[PDB]
Design a protein around this ligand. Structure first.
Ligand code: BCL
Ligand code: BCL
Ligand SMILES: CC[C@H]1c2cc3[nH]c4c(c3C)C(=O)[C@H](C(=O)OC)c4c3nc(cc4[nH]c(cc(n2)[C@@H]1C)c(C(C)=O)c4C)[C@@H](C)[C@@H]3CCC(=O)OC/C=C(\C)CCC[C@H](C)CCC[C@H](C)CCCC(C)C
Ligand SMILES: CC[C@H]1c2cc3[nH]c4c(c3C)C(=O)[C@H](C(=O)OC)c4c3nc(cc4[nH]c(cc(n2)[C@@H]1C)c(C(C)=O)c4C)[C@@H](C)[C@@H]3CCC(=O)OC/C=C(\C)CCC[C@H](C)CCC[C@H](C)CCCC(C)C
Ligand SMILES: CC(C)=CCC/C(C)=C\CC/C(C)=C/CC/C(C)=C/CC/C(C)=C\CC/C(C)=C/CC/C(C)=C/CC/C(C)=C/CC/C(C)=C/CC/C(C)=C/CC1=C(C)C(=O)c2ccccc2C1=O
Ligand SMILES: COC1=C(OC)C(=O)C(C/C=C(\C)CC/C=C(\C)CC/C=C(\C)CC/C=C(\C)CC/C=C(\C)CC/C=C(\C)CC/C=C(\C)CC/C=C(\C)CC/C=C(\C)CCC=C(C)C)=C(C)C1=O
Ligand SMILES: COC(C)(C)C/C=C/C(C)=C/C=C/C(C)=C/C=C/C(C)=C/C=C\C=C(C)\C=C\C=C(C)\C=C\C=C(C)\C=C\CC(C)(C)OC
Ligand SMILES: CCCCCCCCCCCCO[C@@H]1O[C@H](CO)[C@@H](O[C@H]2O[C@H](CO)[C@@H](O)[C@H](O)[C@H]2O)[C@H](O)[C@H]1O
Ligand SMILES: CCCCCCCCCCCCO[C@@H]1O[C@H](CO)[C@@H](O[C@H]2O[C@H](CO)[C@@H](O)[C@H](O)[C@H]2O)[C@H](O)[C@H]1O
Ligand SMILES: CCCCCCCCCCCCO[C@@H]1O[C@H](CO)[C@@H](O[C@H]2O[C@H](CO)[C@@H](O)[C@H](O)[C@H]2O)[C@H](O)[C@H]1O
Ligand SMILES: CCCCCCCCCCCCO[C@@H]1O[C@H](CO)[C@@H](O[C@H]2O[C@H](CO)[C@@H](O)[C@H](O)[C@H]2O)[C@H](O)[C@H]1O
Ligand SMILES: CCCCCCCCCCCCO[C@@H]1O[C@H](CO)[C@@H](O[C@H]2O[C@H](CO)[C@@H](O)[C@H](O)[C@H]2O)[C@H](O)[C@H]1O
Ligand SMILES: [Ca+2]
Ligand SMILES: [Fe+3]
Ligand SMILES: [Mg+2]
Lengths: 318, 46, 47, 274, 268, 47, 47, 47, 47, 48, 47, 46, 47, 47
């Protein structure tokens, strides 16, 4: 039995790191950093500090308003019963506006609250995105986080804003609930003929599978070479060590090709962003330009034809 | 680019000739295709 | 306007410009193909 | 044929079976004994799939379908053109997947690396054998496995999902999806983090170390897991996604037959709020 | 025309799919170029370089290092003479060490020519330091302190005792164990954290339940106790160089094949 | 116009151009194959 | 043909053979079981 | 034709050849078992 | 044409040629087996 | 000498390789002749 | 029984005890509210 | 039997034992509540 | 009051202000388009 | 034949052999359990 580098056996404690000095024009960091023993078992023990600039407080306030609108509406749906609130929490939702209103502003009685929560949640997410951009720039680091985040926002925006805008109805958008938004997801595929046959849904799943596959490969590869300092990836990129060589050689000998320490994270970055990028395009296509994906599959020779175990059933409604 | 002006002109001479030859063959191909089935509909629509 | 190349590298500007021009051209050709009047391959009648 | 740093590592030993006889390379690929068995099972399985494609109605890649036998055949071997070919390919696939994992073990030993990658691949193999062996075994028929076709097995997923009227309500499926979503979210963050420090915002800027990596996430989300933690967590999320996927499909049918939303009535009928 | 239709059979979704296929093909081509920034150009088994062209092999990537360390170029070619000989003549054959592969840096014991300077924090001081050089850092309470425990080899024989802990300043974690050798020619030896297992009464399932450890200590299954004496020695005190880190960790990596020989030869 | 090659490498430009020309030609051939009038393999009648 | 042991080391050519032979043996028994005539356990009438 | 072994190593060649010959052999045996006429275990009537 | 071997490695060319030819050969056999007329194991009647 | 075999070793391997290939092919030829005598695999115009 | 405070930390055991006591009290109030007879807010009739 | 505390820490044993005792007690009470005979709150006839 | 700019940086304020004004302008333009009376593109009648 | 135990590890050879023997023994028992004739628990009548 050898050490598998799953949990840190010996943690050390010292002064907390306050972060690299930010350039002038930045707010002071908030919070007093502390050490969490159980977090240090897996990774860094230090919790905080956090940066709360104008973007952070504005995004928190906008997100707080959206959550409060959702939560108070779900609480009101169970007659303000906290017992029924907890019991029915996965089933409750802030329902999207009724289809009769189209894109017009709906009353509070028929989905006006959903539009406000969607607006404030979108503002919170957008303000969080620029904060992700700003925090990277202020440290001098590249803005890879912000643009990977933009891909996730892209699917979020098409799901609740862009596609309902194209369909001309806020009713096409996702309810703010746990089970109801699963119902919407199931109903969306059912309405547009088996979203399995959406080729961009296929692509999104391939990248979602690939992203999970890549992190399984990359996480295991780095842990298997962490005995040679493989976890210090940026140091390996600048100054290649035997950990990078062993990591590349393992995959070169396995599947005939390999990446570098830097380029594997380019594979990781692109596979993740392509999951939501392809997914957002696929969602944007259905209802606007394709209305039955299975029939699109049979039109393009995608859907298999199965042998008839029963005679074809005539539609009794003529 | 690591190219002197002399080689730049000499490549451009061959590049233009090859582009013209490629375009000329394509122009003949388009003329043959037009004689087969013209692709501009007209008021009646083919 | 020659000063604009003091801020923009001609190589990256030309590559971006050519990519933009081709994508726009393909986009406009496809938009016409989606219209009944201007689809020259389907050849619908005028009016 | 060799990377500039590869020659020193191309040494003997580390094999499990065969030892010296199969210890060589063909181009970039290491062979080993399990590489030969991987090639044997891969060629046999691929050839039988192509043969089933040839004997099928169409050569369309999306429409090629090697279906499992009928449920009436139970756990026995069906005729080759009535699902028996699928059964043979399934054995070949399992032989190829296990040989591939064992080949990775030999390469890991030869390089002094840990066995994390073959173990992580074992989770993927476990999900496949759950779909193709364990769940059909618990249901009593090999015809419960998914067919071998690019689009036919997507139809299988849809029909199995709707065999429980709402597969989103499956509790283990809910956990598995969240892990799949979490690992992609973590992968995007981790790839972005490493690229951000190795590719600074201003070109030709000093490269950033782990302090900038920690500081950005502490500035951004208030916590940084560190370079070691993200690979531990990323592997955990990916493996949890694979593991809970196997759980979610193995409890559908063998241990739950009704609609998945029915299952949540235990929570609604708790004596604290009944 | 139908709303999604383009040419009777062509529709917007189909051409959008093909647009992505073009982009994905370009992305895969771009990603493979990034994969070739290290390890290329390829060379034959005898060292003769292979032909890579230009559309695949990208221009060298130059990282400017912090702390005034200059600039680093990806694809560094190691200059140490390889003490290996091809077992067979045909390409793809393994290589045999013309000496002791454990000390020569061959196979699992291979070490790359990393920088001969210590890793530095952003402030500019050494990242990896012993606990004697910085009392501001200490082992966390609730985790067994390796300092004092005896280090056992793979064969179960005692190899020495921990004398100090080398920690990373950036990430508050133990990086190396300074082991005073039980057998002396005070010769100290560095054991990386990932190559050792702590078996005290505070690890887990022992602090939770309260069970004392039967045989507490540091257990190293990578090397036998006899091979601990040959672990590469750091040149200086209170400072470990990145190249020294590589050689120590490469020596442990080759131990399972060359020291204990449990990976040497087939299992069955 | 010969100065264009003092910006872009002629050999890599030729590779990209030839790849672009073949891909464009393939897609234009396929676009015609998707039409009834210009599908020379299906061979539908005119008018 | 004794020269094959110069080429192939017999110390592990046997394990690669024994696990080959058994898997083939276990599989031929399986194919016979799948048949109506040769399934010695079900024992159908020979005709 | 002995010069082929000055290009192909006998060890790797024989391993690849014997593996290929075995895969092909049982693949063809499988193909016959899948047919009506040549399934010697099912014993379908001729013509 | 002996000059092609000044350019192409005879060993790598032979390896690439042999595997390519077998893959092409086996796929042509597969395509024939997928047709009614040329499936020799099925033996469908002519015309 | 790409494979490390001298000319004589290539001679010796080829002679045994050809002999065993001939023996392997002869057995297969006999098997095919027996298979043909059992059920020929070339259909004919009516396809048996 | 005064010796239990030699082993148990008085501060930590009081926090756990008070947390446990309140959680138990809430759930018992919860369970009674769930019943028809003991829901003092709904006020269902006896018998 | 007084030597059992030589092996096990009295503090950790008592915490585990008390947690086990309460969890079992809650578990048994809930099982009775699930039965029709022993649910003292619904109060069914014997 | 000129003293407003000692507190807040002129450059950051202008960047946020320009983005905020444009987003608000887009917000209001969209709201008007969502109404029957003020959708100038649809051009509904009064009353 | 006692010399082979110098070349084979006696420990893990015995472990693998016992694992193989038990798996085969379990498998053969299961195959009998799946037959109508040799199921000694279901106990169907002979003939
Ligand atoms: C019956 C159901 C249908 C189906 C219906 C749909 C629908 C509808 C959709 C998908 C989508 C996807 N489907 Mg599907 N899907 C089916 C079957 C599957 C199967 C399977 C094996 O059966 C798999 C693996 C998948 C997987 C996938 C993914 C590839 C893709 C989601 C990408 C993603 O991660 O976005 C998830 C992340 C987001 C959506 C948001 C990203 C981040 C945002 C910004 C989060 C903000 C957090 C916020 C601030 C938190 C506070 C909020 C407040 C508390 C409220 N589907 C079947 C056929 N599927 C999505 C897609 O794009 O595909 C084309 C999609 O819209
Ligand atoms: C209408 C359909 C139902 C539904 C019905 C089902 C059914 C049925 C299943 C799932 C399964 C899944 N569903 Mg679902 N699911 C639905 C909607 C969703 C949505 C969504 C956005 O709505 C999401 C995100 C998901 C997500 C998921 C995942 C948790 C899971 C698929 C991943 C997996 O199993 O990996 C595990 C899979 C692997 C690890 C693959 C194994 C890889 C092998 C070992 C290697 C092969 C190598 C290969 C041969 C190499 C080829 C050679 C090449 C040349 C290289 N579902 C809807 C509601 N879902 C599946 C599951 O969890 O089962 C395990 C499953 O069976
Ligand atoms: C590449 C695509 C994948 C992806 C990527 C991705 N996601 C991202 C990012 C990236 C690269 C970020 O950088 C960003 C981030 O912050 O990551 C840490 C983010 C993020 N992705 C998130 C979620 C998320 N990602 C998802 C998916 C995915 N993300 C894809 C799989 C999903 C799914 C599957 O649905 C979710 C749910 C967030 C964790 C984060 C963006 C968070 C955000 O925008 O927050 C804005 C601010 C708020 C909403 C604040 C609200 C909460 C406050 C606590 C309100 C209350 C204030 C106050 C305390 C009130 C006090 C009240 C009391 C007194 C009573
Ligand atoms: C469990 C966590 C995730 C994971 C992990 C993971 N996968 C892995 C690994 C790891 C750690 C490897 O090391 C291994 C590898 O080599 O990666 C490059 C691998 C791998 N994961 C792969 C694919 C893969 N992983 C998937 C998923 C996942 N892998 C999980 C999400 C999926 C999904 C969800 O679809 C796929 C398709 C391969 C690229 C590779 C394993 C390669 C292998 O097994 O090689 C030997 C076999 C062949 C080369 C061919 C065998 C062919 C068969 C004989 C016939 C076909 C049978 C098959 C059932 C046909 C089905 C067809 C239909 C489904 C259309
Ligand atoms: C027996 C015999 C010899 C002959 C028989 C002959 C016969 C039967 C018949 C005759 C005919 C015949 C076939 C002849 C003989 C011909 C023959 C086959 C010879 C023998 C060949 C042999 C020996 C074995 C078999 C070879 C084989 C099966 C190959 C298929 C390989 C395969 C499955 C590919 C999947 C690719 C995909 C899509 C993967 C998904 C992940 C992904 C998108 C990855 C990219 C990022 C990345 C690169 C990530 C890694 C990484 C990570 C994760 C890090 O984290 C990291 C960190 C740091 C640095 C680098 C890295 C780093 O690289
Ligand atoms: C190497 O650089 C890096 C760091 O630090 C230097 C980092 O901290 C981070 C960021 C680290 C994180 C912890 C953020 C990501 C967190 C998660 C995905 C947590 C998910 C946790 C769960 C338990 C959800 C799983 C699902 C269910 C159902 C529960 C990254 C990416 C990084 O790359
Ligand atoms: C004290 O606090 C208490 C109440 C506890 C607060 C607790 C609240 C709780 C428990 C809240 C629980 C919330 C839950 C469970 C939420 C679940 C949300 C889920 C699952 C959402 C999933 C999908 C939703 C999507 C994709 C919605 C997208 C909506 C969008 C993109 C809306 C965009 C709207 C815009 C941009 C509006 C613009 C305004 C316009 C332009 C229309 O003005 C004219
Ligand atoms: C974030 C910003 C997203 C901006 C998206 C680009 C602009 C979209 O432009 C928008 O397209 C949709 C789709 O035709 C139009 O929507 C219109 O047609 C749809 C067709 O179903 C009608 O149901 C709807 O009543 C009508 O508003 C909007 O009138 C137009 O303004
Ligand atoms: C120093 C004195 C000589 C200097 C000048 C030397 C010649 C300079 C170029 C002359 C014109 C060549 O023009 C080039 O010819 C080739 C010949 O196949 C033609 O190319 C044609 O055949 C090729 C196949 O090979 C097709 O793929 C292509 O679609 C078609 O156009 C084109 O016409 C053009 O690409
Ligand atoms: C690896 C996972 C563990 C495998 C070990 C065996 C677990 C028990 C499985 O036992 C398996 O169950 C199935 C149904 O579930 C049953 O098999 C059943 O299927 C047939 C239909 O094909 C039914 O008509 C009949 O009720 C029964 O024979 C058998 O009892 C057994 O084949
Ligand atoms: C379709 C034609 C190619 O499409 C284009 O190809 C380039 C090739 O680098 C890739 O673009 C990618 O590399 C470029 C540098 O070249 C980077 O800015 C970035 O990593 C990414 O955009 C994408 O694939 C796509 O933007
Ligand atoms: C995990 C690994 C073990 C998987 C489970 C195997 C259990 C054996 O289960 C048993 O298999 C044999 C095949 O060998 C079948 O035995 C017989 O059944 C039917 C009878 O017409 C045939 O189609 C089958 O080919 C024949 O062998 C039994 O019907 C089945 O019940
Ligand atoms: Ca229930
Ligand atoms: Fe990494
Ligand atoms: Mg709903």
């Amino acid at each position: 039995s050898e050490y598998q580098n799953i949990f840190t056996q010996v943690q050390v404690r010292g002064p907390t790191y306050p972060g690299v000095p930010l350039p002038v024009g930045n707010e002071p960091r908030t919070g007093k950093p502390g050490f969490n023993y159980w977090l240090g078992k897996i990774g860094n023990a230090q919790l905080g500090p956090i940066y709360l600039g104008w973007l952070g407080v504005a995004s928190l306030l906008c997100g707080f308003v959206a959550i409060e609108i959702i939560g108070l509406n779900m609480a009101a749906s169970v007659n303000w019963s906290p017992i029924e609130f907890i019991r029915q929490l996965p089933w409750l939702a802030l329902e999207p506006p009724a289809p009769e209103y189209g894109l017009s502003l709906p009353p509070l009685q028929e989905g006006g609250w959903w539009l406000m929560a969607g607006f404030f949640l979108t503002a919170s997410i957008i303000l969080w995105w620029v904060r992700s951009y700003r925090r990277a720039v202020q440290l001098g680091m590249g803005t890879h986080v912000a643009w990977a985040f933009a891909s996730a926002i892209w699917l979020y925006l098409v799901l609740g804003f862009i596609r309902p805008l194209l369909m001309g109805s806020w009713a096409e958008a996702v309810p703010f609930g746990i089970f109801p938004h699963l119902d919407w997801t199931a109903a969306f595929s059912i309405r547009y003929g088996n979203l399995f046959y959406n080729p961009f849904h296929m692509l999104s799943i391939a990248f979602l599978y690939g992203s999970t596959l890549l992190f399984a490969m990359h996480g295991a590869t780095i842990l298997a070479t962490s005995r040679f300092g493989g976890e210090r990836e940026v140091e390996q990129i600048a100054d290649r060590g035997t950990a990078t060589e062993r990591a590349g050689l393992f995959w070169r000998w396995t599947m005939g090709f390999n990446a570098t320490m830097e380029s594997i994270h380019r594979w990781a970055w692109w596979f993740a962003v392509l999951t939501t990028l392809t997914g957002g395009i696929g969602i944007l296509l259905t209802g606007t330009v394709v209305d039955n994906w299975y029939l699109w599959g049979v039109k393009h020779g995608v859907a298999p034809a199965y042998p008839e175990v029963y005679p074809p059933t005539p539609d009794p409604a003529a | 680019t690591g190219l002197s002006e002399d080689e730049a002109k000499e490549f451009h001479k061959i590049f233009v000739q090859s582009f013209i030859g490629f375009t000329v063959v394509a122009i003949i191909a388009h003329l043959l295709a037009w004689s087969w089935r013209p692709w501009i509909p007209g008021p009646e629509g083919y | 306007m020659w000063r604009i190349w003091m801020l923009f590298d001609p190589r990256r500007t030309l590559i971006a410009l050519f990519t933009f021009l081709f994508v726009l051209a393909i986009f406009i050709h496809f938009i016409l193909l989606s219209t009944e009047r201007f689809n020259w391959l389907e050849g619908n009648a005028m009016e | 044929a060799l990377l500039s740093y590869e020659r020193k590592y191309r040494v003997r030993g580390g094999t499990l079976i065969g030892g010296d006889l199969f210890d060589f390379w063909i181009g970039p690929f290491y062979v080993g004994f399990f590489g030969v068995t991987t090639l044997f099972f891969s060629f046999l399985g691929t050839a039988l799939i192509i043969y089933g494609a040839a004997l099928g109605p169409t050569w369309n890649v999306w429409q090629i379908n090697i279906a499992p036998p009928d449920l009436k055949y139970g756990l026995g071997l069906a005729p080759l053109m009535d699902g028996g070919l699928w059964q043979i390919i399934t054995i070949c696939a399992i032989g190829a997947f296990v040989s591939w994992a064992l080949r990775e073990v030999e390469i890991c030993r030869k390089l002094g690396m840990g066995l994390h990658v073959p173990i992580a691949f074992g989770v993927a193999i476990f999900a496949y054998v759950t779909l193709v062996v364990i769940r059909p075994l618990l249901l009593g028929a090999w015809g419960h496995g998914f067919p071998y076709g690019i689009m036919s097995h997507l139809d299988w997923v849809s029909n199995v999902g709707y065999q429980y009227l709402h597969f989103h309500y499956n509790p283990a499926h809910m956990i598995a999806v969240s892990f799949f979503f979490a690992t992609t979210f973590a992968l995007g963050l981790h790839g972005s983090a490493i690229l951000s420090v190795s590719n600074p915002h201003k070109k030709g800027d000093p490269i950033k170390g782990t302090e900038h990596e920690d500081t950005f996430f502490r500035d951004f989300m208030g916590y940084s897991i560190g370079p070691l933690g993200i690979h531990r967590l990323g592997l955990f999320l990916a493996l949890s996604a694979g593991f809970w996927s196997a759980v979610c499909i193995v409890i559908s049918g063998p241990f739950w037959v009704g609609g998945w939303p029915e299952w949540w009535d235990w929570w609604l009928e708790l004596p604290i709020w009944s | 025309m139908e709303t999604g239709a383009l040419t009777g059979y062509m529709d917007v979704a189909q051409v959008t799919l093909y647009v992505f296929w073009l982009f994905f093909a370009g992305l895969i081509f771009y990603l493979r170029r990034e994969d070739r920034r290290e390890g290329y150009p390829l060379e034959k088994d005898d060292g003769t370089p292979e032909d890579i062209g230009l559309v695949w092999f990208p221009k060298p990537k130059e990282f400017t290092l912090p702390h005034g360390r200059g600039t680093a170029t990806a694809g560094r070619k190691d200059q140490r003479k390889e003490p290996i000989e091809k077992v067979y003549a045909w390409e793809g054959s393994p290589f045999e060490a013309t000496g002791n592969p454990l000390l020569d840096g061959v196979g699992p014991a291979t070490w790359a020519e990393r920088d001969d300077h210590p890793d530095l924090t952003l402030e500019g001081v050494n990242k990896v330091v012993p606990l004697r050089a910085d009392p501001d850092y200490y082992p966390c309470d609730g985790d067994d302190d390796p300092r004092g425990m005896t280090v056992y080899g793979a064969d179960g024989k005692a190899a020495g005792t921990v004398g100090d802990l080398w920690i990373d300043k950036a990430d508050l974690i133990v990086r190396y164990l300074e082991v005073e050798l039980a057998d002396q020619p005070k010769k100290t030896v560095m054991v990386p954290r990932e190559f050792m297992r702590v078996k005290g009464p505070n690890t887990f399932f022992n602090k939770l339940i309260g069970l004392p450890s039967t045989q507490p200590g540091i257990y190293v299954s990578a090397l036998n106790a006899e091979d601990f004496k040959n672990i590469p020695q750091i040149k200086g005190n209170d400072q470990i160089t990145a190249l020294e880190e590589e050689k120590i960790t490469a020596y442990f990596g080759g131990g399972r094949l060359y020291s204990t020989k449990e990976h040497a030869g087939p299992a069955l």
